[model samples]
Target: VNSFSGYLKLTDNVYIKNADIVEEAKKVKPTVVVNAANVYLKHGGGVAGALNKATNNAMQVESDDYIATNGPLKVGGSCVLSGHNLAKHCLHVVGPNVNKGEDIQLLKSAYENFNQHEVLLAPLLSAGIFGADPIHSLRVCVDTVRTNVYLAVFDKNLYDKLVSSFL
Candidate 1:
């Protein structure tokens, strides 16, 4: 089983780590797991897909129901849902799409929107298909979170880049 390979303490409460988020979530059992989500909260690819699959597709069904009830989320908006098999709750945030001219403030807002929790398992928002730079996304993630955070990074090269940023 994969374990954390690197760690950086950003503050008294926040930290970043190189680890598989799904595996770590299962072990750490953070108060909430953050999903780098689309406006529709679709759990299709990247971190969303993995979390949905881990929860046996219940995450997808819950997301679909949420969207149907509330419509799509705007950039930087978020909602909390049942975590299914992962954690106690899943916080889904719609980050900015940099390719569409959205900027870093929205990305920062995505991180800032998280409610108070003892521990948060989060991914680098907008760093996947949304086209934001992983390093920049990681910086915003590490900077904005106020509570204890286990930032789960799965890509080796991206993880190396993030770890080196603190060096």
Candidate 2:
């Protein structure tokens, strides 16, 4: 494997393509994230919003947080869908996008929670693009599409880590 910014490197894709975000979250919960972001509600609470949250947080927050908050963290949000629809039920908790860079504590919170498998999916665009490490992005993509496997459980970061570990 190649090394890029401390992340394992891969060719074509990050090698975690088929990795299930929900399934992995069920296993190892890291509970220590670096940066964090959420799906952009400005784009409306829909798939686009999840993708937006993913884009912003993907670089730091794990899939468990991004995917879990939406998928499993079903309580304490403004509006939660009844069916636990992975696409529209979750909401990503985020700091101001501008000051997000300096908020290490926020990252710690996400890490701590995600470690327990307490996060869900984010906006795909923001989180995915920020993953400068191709392997990281690949893991994100792999989990993004497979939330159903663990939709009933798993946190956002937990899911992300499961995918990354294999890479």
Candidate 3:
């Protein structure tokens, strides 16, 4: 596993990394995870799904009431899950379903909701089926959090691509 880290002006703690997201999730033991989710906070799919599998499908029950009250959250909005797995809180935010090219802005808005978290996990959002380039998406995430961004990266191709672009 490899990692990229440095301090940015926007915030004091920021790091982007390439490692097992779920496994590393334990060591960091974040206070909150800015996890990407669909309207239902679908824990059976994508990163949320993987986390659900890891935590024995605990998300659905924890999120049921929240989803009922706020199904289909807006692009930049988020819902909170307390007494959750891995992280103390789960900040389930809506992410793009397709590459709309607004990922950077919307992701910024998502992160804005929980700036108070001392330690946070910032997902490599929209880099998968949602279709944002990993490098671009991550760059934006890092810049936004500018601090306490315990990032989890799983795409080697994307990491190497990021390097090539800068070099």
Candidate 4:
């Protein structure tokens, strides 16, 4: 497994870095890795989807059961469950539409589900598929979330820029 290199703080208590989410998850054994879900609890694409797919679709049944019992989560809302092959607990939130420009709020609410958990693994939310730029996602997260943040990204330049900016 590729181990996490290190982290650079971008805000009062948030850090960004180049770490593979799954690999980092394994090493950190975090309490919960936040998963942004749709109203349908679809774990079949993007970050959460890919993670679920990696776990042999382990989150499918519980997510279905959750929605069936709790009703669909409104956009910007969330719930928590066992991470299965992902993490200790999976915090699922209803993400915002990319075109809506309201994902910052949704992202905020999603991270809030942890209630001050020190370590967290969050991808560049709203950066892929959801239409926000990577920089935008990082900025929103840095400003709102106060934790030991570990970010995963595929691009070395972007990762370096994030780190260099803090340095």
Which has the greatest lDDT?
1
**Model 1, residue pairs in steric clash:** none
Q: What's the CA error at residue 37 for candidate 1, in Å? A: 0.7
Question: Which lDDT tens digits does candidate 3 get at residues 21-132?
Answer: 6666656566676676776677776677877676776777767767677666788778778625577877777766555555446766766655666667766776676676
Please write out the lDDT profile of model 1 over residues 1-167, one tens digit for every residue: 22333567766655677788899888867668998888888788889999999999999999999999999998998999998878899999889978778866898788887646656778888987788888888777667877667688788788878777753
Give one digit per residue, the lDDT tens place, for model 2 in 1-167: 22112222233322222233332222333221112234332323333333334445432244444355654331112222211212323334342232234332233233223223233332222233232233333344444332211221123463465445544
Q: Candidate 3 has what TM-score?
A: 0.78
State TM-scores per candidate: 0.89, 0.27, 0.78, 0.80
RMSD of 4: 3.4
Instruction: Give candidate 2 misplaced runs (Cα > 4 Å).
Output: 1-40, 44-88, 95-100, 115-167
Give candidate 4's TM-score: 0.80
* Model 2 lDDT, full chain set: 0.31
The C-alpha lDDT values of all candidates are 0.81, 0.31, 0.64, 0.69
lDDT of 4 by residue, 27-137 (tens): 776777777577778787777777777677778888889879988887767777887866888777665767665645676665555446666676776666666667766
Question: Which stretches of candidate 1 lie above 4 Å from their native place?
Answer: 1-6
The best-first sequence of candidates by lDDT reads 1, 4, 3, 2
Clashing pairs in 4: none
In candidate 4, where is summed lDDT lowest over 10 consecutive residues? 1-10
